[PDB]
């Protein structure tokens, strides 16, 4: 009796019932065009979403265009993952 | 008095994971007609640094958000009319 | 003028959800029930009385945009956001099922004097559908005067004799277009006064039988516009073309288009309502904000004259 494409789950997914127990659609072809939305979803990718950077990014307005540009020193305004995150934007495709 | 009807045969039989993905699926292709990827990737962000990341809670959990903020944003820009 | 008065009463959240997400609401034919349709396509119909959910049903893939119910309470239209079928109709009586879809119709509506007529609309094309058999029964569309109208919806005058489309007016037994009003907005495309004499586009208000323009209204503009069962008063919340949707309704005088109050409920309003017999008003009301993670979506429901 019930239509099948139009047919929803009855259990829904909770807050309190969701615990993790420890992608969607693609970025733009070129860098250039990317604001710091798009940044951050790059950023995630490669291991970089410490909530404070991600923060910074969206203060600061870096779009993608600027993301080549930097160095340490910004990333400091852990030493260890600024030499990563630098040699991340450094070899990735756009 | 009235009485409301009763539900149809087979409602709530689909699974989550399968329900989850093809409404994913369709809304992310449909919405990419409608908005810049900037704002997609907006509302992607925030429910995963949100509800994934700072509130750890599944990933499934933080894209069921997510399906919910894509269907309010389409209902918004449907409502106020469409070009195309 | 006791419609300068509105008392929150009670207030409807989706009750399996962190999140509400109503978009749409109607009362039932006989006001027992408010069905409030969701933003993922389901309907939710609660007891007005004792504000739980009595029902849930599943209708589309998308944000249910419209709601009516048949005055005999047997068939229930509804309208979704972007996934087909776009439109449908419902059975009410014992079992709820689909009796037809309109697939690429994005609003419906039922014929006014007997609704035994669905009229669709898909853009600027207007489809007038029978009930029983859910043949289309006629296309109006005339290419030459489209005003192309962004929210198209077309609807039948009080009596069934005639079409609105477009800004277009339709003589529905020659099944010709008989006047095309002049366009002032890209968005409204208008609406018959329930006294058959006037037409309301947007801020114009035309009369029927000289098509001489009557009242231009600025407060209008861009509003969702609602009658109260009697014909005395029209509703009005703004849908502009941060969120489009007006954080406030004004209320109008049906017979001279004369303001009567305007009122802040310092929420977006998606939709609202109101029953015939005029006690309540339905408000969906949306958390505004700049921060895209607050969208929760509720019902409150008002009683009108009460301070
Ligand atoms: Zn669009």
Avoid at chain 3, 59 to 75: F, K, M, V
Wanted: glycine letters at 6%.
């Amino acid at each position: 009796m019930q239509q099948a494409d139009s047919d929803q789950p009855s259990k829904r997914p909770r807050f309190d019932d969701s615990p993790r127990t420890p992608p969607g659609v693609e970025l733009h072809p070129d860098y250039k065009t990317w604001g710091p939305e798009q940044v951050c979803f790059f950023l995630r990718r490669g291991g970089f979403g410490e909530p404070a950077l991600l923060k910074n990014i969206r203060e600061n307005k870096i779009t993608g265009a600027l993301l080549p540009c930097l160095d340490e020193s910004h990333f400091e305004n852990s030493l260890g993952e600024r030499k990563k995150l630098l040699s991340y934007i450094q070899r990735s495709g756009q | 008095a009235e009485r409301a009807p009763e539900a149809p045969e087979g409602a709530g039989e689909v699974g989550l994971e399968q329900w989850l993905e093809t409404s994913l699926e369709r809304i992310n292709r449909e919405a990419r007609l409608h908005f810049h990827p900037e704002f997609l990737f907006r509302l992607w962000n925030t429910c995963v640094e949100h509800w994934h990341d700072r509130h750890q809670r599944s990933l499934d959990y933080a894209k069921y958000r997510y399906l919910l903020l894509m269907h309010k944003a389409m209902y918004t820009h449907m409502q106020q009319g469409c070009p195309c | 003028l006791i419609f300068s008065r509105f008392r929150p009463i009670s207030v409807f959240r989706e009750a399996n959800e962190d999140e509400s997400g109503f978009t749409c609401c109607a009362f039932s034919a006989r006001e027992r029930f408010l069905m409030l349709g969701t933003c993922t396509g389901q309907l939710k119909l609660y007891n007005v009385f004792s504000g739980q959910e009595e029902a849930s049903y599943n209708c589309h893939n998308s944000a249910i945009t419209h709601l009516e119910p048949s005055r005999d309470g047997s068939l229930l239209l509804t309208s979704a956001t972007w996934s087909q079928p776009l439109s449908a109709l419902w059975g009410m009586k014992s079992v709820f099922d689909m009796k037809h879809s309109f697939t690429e119709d994005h609003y419906v509506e039922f014929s006014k004097h007997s609704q035994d007529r669905v009229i669709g609309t898909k853009g600027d094309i207007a489809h007038i559908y029978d009930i029983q058999t859910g043949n289309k029964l006629l296309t109006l569309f005339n290419p030459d005067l489209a005003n192309n109208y962004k929210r198209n919806c077309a609807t039948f005058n009080p009596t069934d004799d005639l079409v609105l489309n477009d800004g277009v007016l339709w003589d529905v037994r020659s099944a010709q277009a008989i006047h095309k009003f002049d366009k002032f907005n890209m968005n409204i495309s208008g609406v018959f006064h329930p006294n058959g004499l006037e037409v309301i586009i947007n801020t114009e208000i035309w009369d029927l039988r000289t098509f001489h323009l009557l009242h231009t209204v600025p407060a209008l503009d861009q509003c969702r516009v609602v009658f109260n069962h009697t014909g005395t008063v029209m509703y009005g919340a703004m849908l502009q073309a941060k969120s489009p949707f007006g954080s406030s309704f004004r209320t109008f005088n049906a017979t001279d288009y004369k303001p009567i109050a305007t009122i802040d409920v310092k929420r977006n309003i998606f939709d609202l309502c109101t029953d015939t017999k005029d006690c309540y008003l339905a408000v969906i009301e949306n958390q505004g904000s700049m921060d895209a993670l607050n969208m929760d979506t509720v019902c409150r429901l008002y009683e009108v004259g009460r301070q």
